[PDB]
Design a protein around this ligand. Structure first.
Ligand SMILES: CCCCCCCC/C=C/CCCCCCCC(=O)O[C@H](COC(=O)CCCCCCCCCCCCCCCCC)COP(=O)(O)OC[C@@H](O)CO
Ligand SMILES: CCCCCCCC/C=C/CCCCCCCC(=O)O[C@H](COC(=O)CCCCCCCCCCCCCCCCC)COP(=O)(O)OC[C@@H](O)CO
Ligand SMILES: CCCCCCCC/C=C\CCCCCCCC(=O)O[C@H](COC(=O)CCCCCCCCCCCCCCCCC)COP(=O)(O)OC[C@@H](O)CO
Ligand SMILES: CCCCCCCC/C=C\CCCCCCCC(=O)O[C@H](COC(=O)CCCCCCCCCCCCCCCCC)COP(=O)(O)OC[C@@H](O)CO
Ligand SMILES: CC(C)CCC[C@@H](C)[C@H]1CC[C@H]2[C@@H]3CC=C4C[C@@H](O)CC[C@]4(C)[C@H]3CC[C@]12C
Ligand SMILES: CC(C)CCC[C@@H](C)[C@H]1CC[C@H]2[C@@H]3CC=C4C[C@@H](O)CC[C@]4(C)[C@H]3CC[C@]12C
Ligand SMILES: CC(C)CCC[C@@H](C)[C@H]1CC[C@H]2[C@@H]3CC=C4C[C@@H](O)CC[C@]4(C)[C@H]3CC[C@]12C
Ligand SMILES: CC(C)CCC[C@@H](C)[C@H]1CC[C@H]2[C@@H]3CC=C4C[C@@H](O)CC[C@]4(C)[C@H]3CC[C@]12C
Ligand SMILES: CC(C)CCC[C@@H](C)[C@H]1CC[C@H]2[C@@H]3CC=C4C[C@@H](O)CC[C@]4(C)[C@H]3CC[C@]12C
Ligand SMILES: CC(C)CCC[C@@H](C)[C@H]1CC[C@H]2[C@@H]3CC=C4C[C@@H](O)CC[C@]4(C)[C@H]3CC[C@]12C
Ligand SMILES: CC(C)CCC[C@@H](C)[C@H]1CC[C@H]2[C@@H]3CC=C4C[C@@H](O)CC[C@]4(C)[C@H]3CC[C@]12C
Ligand SMILES: CC(C)CCC[C@@H](C)[C@H]1CC[C@H]2[C@@H]3CC=C4C[C@@H](O)CC[C@]4(C)[C@H]3CC[C@]12C
Ligand SMILES: CC(C)CCC[C@@H](C)[C@H]1CC[C@H]2[C@@H]3CC=C4C[C@@H](O)CC[C@]4(C)[C@H]3CC[C@]12C
Lengths: 298, 298
């Protein structure tokens, strides 16, 4: 086949390669940074609220420490959202660790946001509908923090495995492809530049499947604790809203970032919007009833 | 531009090219066929049991109509499992129709298996939680059949959109790709054959996301009804086991059928095993207790 000969013929012309350029509209960057900054101000306000209010009874009911953990997760997610608006500004290898750290912080933030809510719901379950003759004396926060720490350990083990076994090789390939049907023959000259890793679907499937099992157990716990207490401590509504919103946003953003790596503005806007919507919805559902009942107190 | 001419010359140097086909070992086919045959014998046994004893207290309480709908879904699922092993037989254009029909029966069978259980759980919830003065006199079986039919119609709309928008075209592609990572130049020639759509991840994501929302609502419903009735009627355990098994099997089979197209025997065995395990587990969880309390009562 003359394909091997033309191999080395194109290798000479392969001496150079495109270095990529920035094409992210400034206006969009400004708008998304403004909205994420407003969200971060809201998160910091909630952190300050829970720190300053630790003696109110709504505080004791809504487990302020786990809410601090959730707010830290939200801060990580907004940091990842900020880093999403860093494209082609740098020409160095940093893009490698840029994408790596961005996805790592997405995963860590999602785990740190969703673990504490499921832990609170599991206590509520175990302390309300397990009034067995052997009294459930105490199930302290330390146990839930340990469960969240174990989940974070599993997620970060997956992250180390992904990074150290198959990193995000930033490579550009030019290739002529001869797609032939049963009766029709065609040739194409496709040349694309994508920062992706081999076995990408493997890693996406493992991370998303682990998170999916977590979300299924969270939906189960929200079902168990659906009609067991007041909304400030029930957390079933927020668990379900967050789970469906997370599934929808995750699927949409995965499709968009896959099949539309030619519309950088669209991908960035959609990703920032999805992260903002999910994080803000979770934090608002968690904290707004607390504010309402505190204000009703005084 | 310099590669353009070389690629044009290569396309002319096609000379009809060649195609590659192979057959599985006639032992894995036999094992798969006999195991799915035993599964279908079990399903037909449960069908006959429900048809013959739909007058006992346990069977009537266990909603025999929803169970026969589930059994029909299981029969469709094993039919799809059979069609996974008739692959590499229809050499002509029927291969695309084979894959299309196979995946369509997978979707229809999954919907028909996981709809009736959620319908049963929703009635149970509404009859053990509507103590309001507006008595829930009768929530008819026809309403649960209506919901199952609506979900099936939604699945058919999605399948029709997939078939008539971006269908499965079988293409053989041989191409030469030059990978440049910015520090080294590499050339590779690959001749690969696969049957897929141009927007495969779009359709997979949409279908699996709709099914995921269904599974999340099913986990929620299993949570509500988790400690509400007897096992032969609760159906929370079967919902949870089936949902987790379905998620694990779906992810595993996706990864294997994507990244191991050069290992036909492994993909076929794994797909048949996953379908067999999921369907048999669901049907056994549904029906074995019914048999136990029937034989105990008689
Ligand atoms: C949880 C699940 C449900 C949640 C919903 C899931 C998704 C969440 C999404 C929200 C979507 C945000 C709005 C989408 C806007 C995307 C912009 C876009 O897509 O349009 C552009 C065309 O205009 C431009 O060139 C950009 C200039 C104007 C930008 C402002 C327009 C919208 C103004 C403000 C937008 C910021 C919103 C701030 C809110 C909070 C977000 C933190 C694509 O151009 P292109 O890609 O370059 O195409 C050409 C190609 O050939 C080569 O260039
Ligand atoms: C309770 C009892 C039921 C238990 C059932 C267990 C699930 C078993 C199966 C999972 C899929 C089986 C594997 C066959 C599917 C892949 C074979 C195939 O046809 O290939 C496809 C290409 O097709 C398409 O383009 C569209 C596919 C549409 C899928 C329809 C629904 C599938 C299934 C829907 C039913 C379940 C939904 C998800 C469940 C709940 C979710 C947890 C992938 O493209 P590729 O090979 O990667 O491309 C290589 C690259 O070079 C170019 O893309
Ligand atoms: C806290 C409250 C909720 C917070 C809201 C979170 C929103 C989640 C949303 C969207 C995800 C961000 C979108 C970026 C996803 C990665 C895409 C990307 O940028 O790079 C990819 C490639 O990457 C890889 O190679 C490895 C992928 C790593 C995935 C793990 C990331 C950590 C975990 C990630 C999930 C984190 C959330 C887990 C929830 C789960 C809900 C179910 C491009 O692939 P390709 O170009 O198509 O391949 C071309 C082909 O030829 C060769 O591969
Ligand atoms: C819930 C259970 C625990 C969880 C397990 C999850 C799934 C459960 C179920 C089934 C797993 C299926 C096992 C897959 C093993 C087959 C794949 C494999 O591994 O070997 C393949 C096959 O080789 C052969 O052709 C000769 C061996 C044939 C006999 C296989 C023995 C299996 C019989 C096993 C025991 C009998 C059980 C009957 C099974 C009931 C399942 C319904 C080689 O690959 P290849 O593609 O041809 O390579 C060539 C490449 O280089 C270029 O052509
Ligand atoms: C049983 C569960 C909990 C743990 C198993 C997780 C699986 C999916 C993990 C564990 C080790 C991982 C493998 C580690 C090394 C490689 C080699 C690489 O070139 C391809 C990916 C591959 C093959 C990984 C695929 C995913 C993998 C198999
Ligand atoms: C029911 C919930 C909790 C779990 C399932 C949610 C669904 C919608 C999510 C979670 C895991 C995700 C899958 C994980 C594995 C992959 C590999 C990816 O490269 C293609 C899409 C695909 C197949 C994802 C599709 C969307 C997905 C199936
Ligand atoms: C893209 C669009 C068309 C899909 C719409 C998805 C719909 C069905 C989703 C989005 C949000 C979901 C709701 C989110 C929260 C709750 C509260 C819970 O106590 C009952 C279910 C309920 C009410 C969900 C029902 C299904 C729901 C409405
Ligand atoms: C509130 C509702 C409307 C938001 C739900 C998300 C929907 C509407 C979003 C998610 C992804 C979006 C699509 C993503 C990509 C494209 C391709 C582009 O060339 C045309 C627009 C189109 C088709 C977008 C239209 C709107 C869209 C479908
Ligand atoms: C324009 C888009 C992209 C930004 C949307 C911002 C999101 C986070 C905002 C818009 C409306 C807000 C909601 C308005 C009303 C309520 C009801 C309240 O009982 C819980 C909080 C909740 C649910 C808010 C949460 C945050 C919220 C969802
Ligand atoms: C709740 C209902 C309205 C959601 C409907 C979502 C529909 C509109 C989305 C999901 C899948 C998407 C399709 C995916 C694939 C294709 C084939 C492509 O060549 C044209 C765009 C097209 C046709 C998309 C159109 C928009 C689309 C059909
Ligand atoms: C690789 C490892 C992490 C896989 C672990 C899968 C585990 C988490 C899955 C498989 C079996 C599932 C369990 C099946 C049965 C029950 C009993 C039910 O009353 C509560 C849910 C519960 C407890 C499920 C929890 C999740 C579960 C334990
Ligand atoms: C519940 C848990 C234990 C289920 C685990 C299923 C695992 C063991 C199954 C599912 C996917 C399978 C893998 C699919 C792909 C490969 C790559 C091949 O070159 C060696 C076999 C190997 C590595 C298989 C080993 C067995 C395997 C990893
Ligand atoms: C490759 C195929 C043959 C593997 C099949 C594994 C099957 C037989 C295993 C996996 C799950 C197991 C079931 C798990 C749950 C139950 C319910 C219990 O009340 C009776 C035992 C029973 C019914 C088990 C029977 C054996 C079982 C169905």
């Amino acid at each position: 086949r003359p394909l091997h000969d033309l191999c080395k013929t194109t290798i000479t012309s392969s001496h150079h390669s495109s270095k990529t350029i920035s094409s992210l509209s400034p206006v969009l960057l400004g708008i998304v940074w403004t909205f994420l900054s407003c969200g971060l101000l809201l998160i910091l306000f909630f952190l300050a609220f829970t720190i300053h209010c630790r003696k109110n009874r709504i505080v004791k009911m809504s487990s302020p420490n786990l809410n601090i953990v959730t707010l830290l997760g939200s801060c990580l997610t907004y940091s990842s959202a900020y880093l999403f608006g860093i494209q082609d500004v740098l020409v160095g290898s940093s893009m490698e660790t840029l994408i790596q750290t961005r996805l790592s912080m997405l995963c860590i933030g999602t785990s740190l946001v969703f673990g504490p809510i499921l832990g609170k719901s599991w206590r509520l379950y175990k302390v309300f509908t397990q009034r067995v003759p052997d009294k459930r004396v105490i199930i302290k926060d330390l146990q839930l923090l340990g469960l969240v720490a174990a989940l974070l350990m599993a997620d970060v083990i997956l992250l180390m495995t992904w990074v150290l076994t198959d990193p995000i090789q930033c490579l550009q390939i030019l290739s002529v492809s001869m797609t032939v049907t049963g009766k029709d023959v065609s040739c194409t000259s496709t040349s694309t530049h994508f920062c992706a890793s081999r076995y990408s679907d493997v890693w996406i499937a493992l991370i998303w499947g682990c998170k999916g099992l977590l979300l299924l157990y969270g939906a189960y716990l929200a079902g168990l604790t659906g009609h067991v207490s007041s909304p400030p401590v029930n957390q079933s509504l927020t668990i379900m809203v967050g789970v469906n919103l997370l599934v929808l946003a995750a699927g949409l953003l995965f499709v968009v970032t896959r099949y539309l790596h030619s519309w950088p503005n669209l991908v960035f806007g959609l990703t920032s919007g999805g992260i903002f919507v999910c994080t803000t919805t979770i934090n608002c559902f968690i904290f707004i009833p607390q504010l309402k009942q505190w204000k009703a107190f005084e």
